[PDB]
Structure 1
Amino acid sequence: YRYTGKLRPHYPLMPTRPVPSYIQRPDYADHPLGMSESEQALKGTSQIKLLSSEDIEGMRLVCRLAREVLDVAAGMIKPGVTTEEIDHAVHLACIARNCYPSPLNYYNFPKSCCTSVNEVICHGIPDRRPLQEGDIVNVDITLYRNGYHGDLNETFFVGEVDDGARKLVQTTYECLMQAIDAVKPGVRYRELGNIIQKHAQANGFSVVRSYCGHGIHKLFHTAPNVPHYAKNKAVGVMKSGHVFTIEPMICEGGWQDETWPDGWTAVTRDGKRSAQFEHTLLVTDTGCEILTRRLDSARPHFMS
């Protein structure tokens, strides 16, 4: 394998962490290949659930608990902290909230969150690498509570970063927020990628094509598919009651991705940095409710 930049995996990984059996588990957690039979049963449908009142309450809850766990992780980002140490803290914080860490064993993903540094686009596997001053790191949290999943991410700065890092992270966050600002009933899912790409391209960045936002509720990934690039052909129209994520990955160089031999870590083919933000959104009559927003602070963590 020829690595595309300076990052390398730092092995061995810690043995898989158990979740006590009093915590409710999603279907894939005990499938040997981590397959979700409830998702597979819906693979080839473009149909989108209209959430009931009960479902919306269940989503509001799990998404606020997910935000609290991302905030725990944010508090730990400093030079010399390993991404495994962040994942251990995340795993305990989900269990403290009587939630299961949705990524764990999802298609046999081996950890409880994703930690993506620098050229990693997404799905990085927490490992023994200490964070370095100058890194950008994304921590991606998903919790499962009472049958519902809540999913969010932010990119963070590890100590002092260069100007390129600052601009890429800021632009990525703005891409996400301008797409959220367009969400309301009657808008096509395919429109968000036009917005995101327009703003990324204005800043000299590119938009990853291989990974998309998605419906989420009782299933971790379901309809709609929500691409982040322009002129995509996604199917569907937003209605009050739809819940889904927007999670753009924007890159300093070209958009092309590849995956590491671990079968998870997605990286820029050119080795240049990539940043991402994600929120879980519910469409309301007035636009949308950001289920995974901060309730106690105006800005994302990188802007402190």
Structure 2
Amino acid sequence: MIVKTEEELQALKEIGYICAKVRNTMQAATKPGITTKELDNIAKELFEEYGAISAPIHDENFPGQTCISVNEEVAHGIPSKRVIREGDLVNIDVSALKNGYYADTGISFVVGESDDPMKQKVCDVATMAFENAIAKVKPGTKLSNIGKAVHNTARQNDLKVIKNLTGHGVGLSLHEAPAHVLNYFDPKDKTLLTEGMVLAIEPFISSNASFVTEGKNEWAFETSDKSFVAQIEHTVIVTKDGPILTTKI
């Protein structure tokens, strides 16, 4: 959506804070021995506490408050009896709505220590990709400058991007214009960012695979070569004075 009122801005900040709080709380509780459903239950209780509603459930009838994706799973993992183990690469993606406004945020991290430093590496680079992407965000700038930054960041670190997963406009729903925020540069795109535009920027950085496929169920996205993939997502408002991240505390 395009923000036009201070009341809209406040509503977006409110739901962004809630999603960030939930994301942080879940991440802190992610340790060997907890199940992903147990992690999802935390979101259930906090959403209730803060008067928010799961976007996955509301918008997509997703069977879970949040999406928790582990190891082979890159996105849209279904919270379940799956137990977290030492070294797991975990992505927690929290999206919700309150009073008609939405936020969408996500983080990939490593549980304890893995025997392969690549798991942390994709997390480090996804974080850098996001930072590099938002440095480009201002009214009048090309949307493609986001993907350009993400892919350049990946190349600088001998890594790849997931080409078939993207960001998206957000605010009054989980998906609105721009339809797609790519992780790479499309030279034919003339789409510009404008004042008040609200975007979900979610770079996916991969150890090898350049795309995801259907996973173990109708929701989860995976890679058949079990690449390690990290995502960092925030909800961002494009303003003249710089980007406002509703989902950063």
Class of the TM-score when normalised by the shorter of the 2 chains: over 0.9
Whether the aligned pair in 1 keeps the contact of 2:118 and 2:228 (CA below 8 Å) is: no
Counterpart among 73, 79, 85 of residue 32 in structure 2: 79
Secondary structure, in 3 states, of the residue corresponding to 1:229? coil
Residue in structure 2 matched with residue 95 of structure 1 by the alignment: 48
Q: Which residue of 1 aligns with 2:79?
A: 126
| Alpha-carbon distance change, 181 to 74 in structure 1, aligned in 2, over 3 angstroms | same
1:104 has 2:29 as partner: no
Structure 1 residue 205 corresponds to structure 2 residue 159: yes
What percentage of aligned pairs have identical amino acids?
Answer: 31
> Using the alignment, how far apart are the partners of 2:109 and 2:225 within structure 1?
22
- The equivalent position to 2:137 in structure 1, one of 173, 183, 199, is 183
Given the alignment of the two structures, is residue 166 of structure 1 paired with residue 120 of structure 2, yes or no?
A: yes
Give 1:155's aligned residue.
108
**Aligned partners of 1:261, 1:80: CA distance in 2, in Å?**
22
Is residue 2:225 matched to residue 1:280?
A: no
Aligned to 1:73, the other structure's residue is in SS state helix
Number of residue-to-residue matches in the alignment? 247
Shift, 1:55, TM fit: 1.2
1:167 counterpart letter in structure 2 = K
From 142, 146, 152, the equivalent of 2:99 is: 146
Q: Which residues of structure 1 form unaligned runs of 5+?
A: 1-47, 295-304
CA–CA distance in structure 2, aligned partners of residues 156 and 271 of structure 1: 16
On the 8 A contact 2:109/2:120 being kept in 1, the answer is: no
Does the 8 A contact of 1:94 with 1:100 survive in 2?
yes
What amino acid is aligned across from residue 212 of structure 1 in structure 2? T
Across the aligned residues of Structure 1 and Structure 2, the Cα RMSD in angstroms comes to 1.5
The Cα offsets for residues 92-113 of structure 1, whole Å up to 9 and x where unpaired, read as: 1111101101111533211110
**Cα distance between partner residues in 1 of 2:141 and 2:43:** 35
Partner of 2:225: 270
CA distance in 2, matches of 1:157, 1:271: 16
Cα displacement (A) at 1:51: 3.4
> How big is each residue's C-alpha offset from its partner over 1:165-222, in whole Å with a ceiling of 9 and x where there is no partner?
1211101110011101111111111111011001101212111122211111111110
Question: 1:213–1:232: structure 2 CA closer, same or farther, 3 Å change rule?
Answer: farther
Change over 3 Å in CA distance of 1:234–1:135 after alignment to 2: farther
TM-score, length-scaled by structure 2: 0.94
Residue identity in the other structure for 2:148 = N
Specify whether residues 166 and 278 from structure 1 end up closer, same or farther in structure 2 by C-alpha distance, changes over 3 A only: same
Extract unaligned runs of 5+ from structure 2: none
Shift of 1:236: 2.1
CA contact under 8 A between 1:105 and 1:111: conserved in structure 2?
Answer: no
Structure 1 residue 257: Cα displacement: 1.1
Counterpart mapping for 1:285-304 below 5 A: 285-294=240-249
Structure 2 residue corresponding to 1:231, chosen from 186, 200, 224: 186
Report how far residue 116 of structure 1 moved: 0.9
Alignment check: 8 A CA contact 2:67 2:75 kept: yes
Q: Residues of 2 paired with 1:191 and 1:235: CA distance?
A: 10
SS of 1:263's equivalent in the other structure is coil
Counterpart in 1 of 2:209? 254
The one-character-per-residue Cα deviations of 1:107-140 (angstroms, maximum 9, x if unpaired) are 3211110001122121111111111101110111
1: CA distance between counterparts of 2:187 and 2:222? Answer: 22
* Helix, strand or coil at the partner of 2:209: coil
Tell me which residue corresponds to 1:69: 22
